[PDB]
Amino acid sequence: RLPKPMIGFGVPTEPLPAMVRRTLPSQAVGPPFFYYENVALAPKGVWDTISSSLYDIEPEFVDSKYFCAAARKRGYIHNLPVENRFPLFPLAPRTIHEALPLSKKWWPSWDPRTKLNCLQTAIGSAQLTNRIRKAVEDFDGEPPMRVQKFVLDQCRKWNLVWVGRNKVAPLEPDEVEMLLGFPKNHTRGGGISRTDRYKSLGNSFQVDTVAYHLSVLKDLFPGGINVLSLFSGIGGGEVALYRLGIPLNTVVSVEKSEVNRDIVRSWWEQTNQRGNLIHFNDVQQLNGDRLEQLIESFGGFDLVIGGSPSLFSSYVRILDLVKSIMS
Numbered sequence: 001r002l003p004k005p006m007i008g009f010g011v012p013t014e015p016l017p018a019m020v021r022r023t024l025p026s027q028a029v030g031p032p033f034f035y036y037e038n039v040a041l042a043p044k045g046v047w048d049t050i051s052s053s054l055y056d057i058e059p060e061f062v063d064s065k066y067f068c069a070a071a072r073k074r075g076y077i078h079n080l081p082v083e084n085r086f087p088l089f090p091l092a093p094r095t096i097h098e099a100l101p102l103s104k105k106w107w108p109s110w111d112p113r114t115k116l117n118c119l120q121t122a123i124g125s126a127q128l129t130n131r132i133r134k135a136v137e138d139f140d141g142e143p144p145m146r147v148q149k150f151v152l153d154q155c156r157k158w159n160l161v162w163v164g165r166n167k168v169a170p171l172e173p174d175e176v177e178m179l180l181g182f183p184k185n186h187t188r189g190g191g192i193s194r195t196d197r198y199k200s201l202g203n204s205f206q207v208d209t210v211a212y213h214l215s216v217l218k219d220l221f222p223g224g225i226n227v228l229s230l231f232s233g234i235g236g237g238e239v240a241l242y243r244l245g246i247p248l249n250t251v252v253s254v255e256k257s258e259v260n261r262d263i264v265r266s267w268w269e270q271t272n273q274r275g276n277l278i279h280f281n282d283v284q285q286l287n288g289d290r291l292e293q294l295i296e297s298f299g300g301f302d303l304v305i306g307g308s309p310s311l312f313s314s315y316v317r318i319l320d321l322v323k324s325i326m327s
């Protein structure tokens with residue numbers, strides 16, 4: 001169902017495809033700009049539904065493996081210009097060994113991975129890494145093919161990395177933070193647990209990818225940008241805009257988790273944003289009246305952006321309200 005290399009209309013690290021053009025449906029244009037992200041792998045009918053709900057736009061499928069050392073396959077529905085995109089610099093390390101230098105010295109020659117799988121919320125238990133330890137410990141390299149297959153399967157499944165001889169480990173949160181393009185300690189401290197760190201990171205945007213798409217906005221909004229960020233999580237979008245050097249004037253962030261909200265608030269302060277950050281807890285508390293007053297108070301929204309959430313319906317309802325209001 002998906003393209004041969006998932007580079008969308010193009011990725012910075014490879015040659016542009018032969019086709020980099022898109023003609024936006026007439027209704028799909030106009031302010032505001034919108035950016036919707038969903039899992040790439042999904043039945044035909046779902047993406048059909050999403051497209052029909054979002055002004056007939058066809059999704060742009062891209063794998064974040066072209067932006068970092070971990071794969072992430074996503075479909076992005078948007079109405080942004082597609083040309084003159086530039087990446088965040090410097091480019092993220094794109095192999096496990098580049099990203100995690102301490103992992104290279106203990107990487108067995110028989111482990112061919114140079115790229116991690118999609119980063120998820122759950123982590124490999126001590127029990128499993130123990131099983132792997134005992135499975136490889138008996139041999140002083142290399143282990144029988146069937147055990148090689150057993151441990152390679154477990155490692156791929158759980159994104160385990162080598163940290164010593166006979167020792168694999170799940171990624172620690174700082175490693176995940178950097179793989180996703182977040183500043184270090186972005187999710188550390190302040191009342192969030194470790195497992196919740198993994199859950200908030202596992203559900204986030206890959207920042208380099210998103211920034212590559214949003215980079216076209218930098219010239220358009222020198223006054224600063226007003227953003228409706230829906231299901232904003234730990235603020236992947238805001239961090240992308242920030243790393244792009246796009247000033248943020250007003251951000252309306254709708255996020256159910258208090259832990260996520262606090263993470264984003266801390267970040268907002270730490271980066272000394274002069275602009276305004278406004279939090280709402282439920283996407284269902286943004287009615288036409290609330291949107292109206294937000295807009296008459298702060299000006300219209302330049303970008304509305306949301307990620308992988310009836311909640312999609314909430315996104316659509318809200319985007320439609322905003323576009324209606326703005327004309």
Ligand SMILES: Nc1ncnc2c1ncn2[C@@H]1O[C@H](C[C@@H](N)CC[C@H](N)C(=O)O)[C@@H](O)[C@H]1O
Nearest residue numbers: 203204205231232233234236255256283307308
């Ligand atoms: N009803 C809701 N209203 C607003 N946010 C929700 C709601 N339900 C779940 N969420 C938040 O949805 C975010 C949707 C995630 N895919 C977001 C990841 C986020 N975009 C990031 O880049 O970090 C999470 O914070 C979900 O917990």
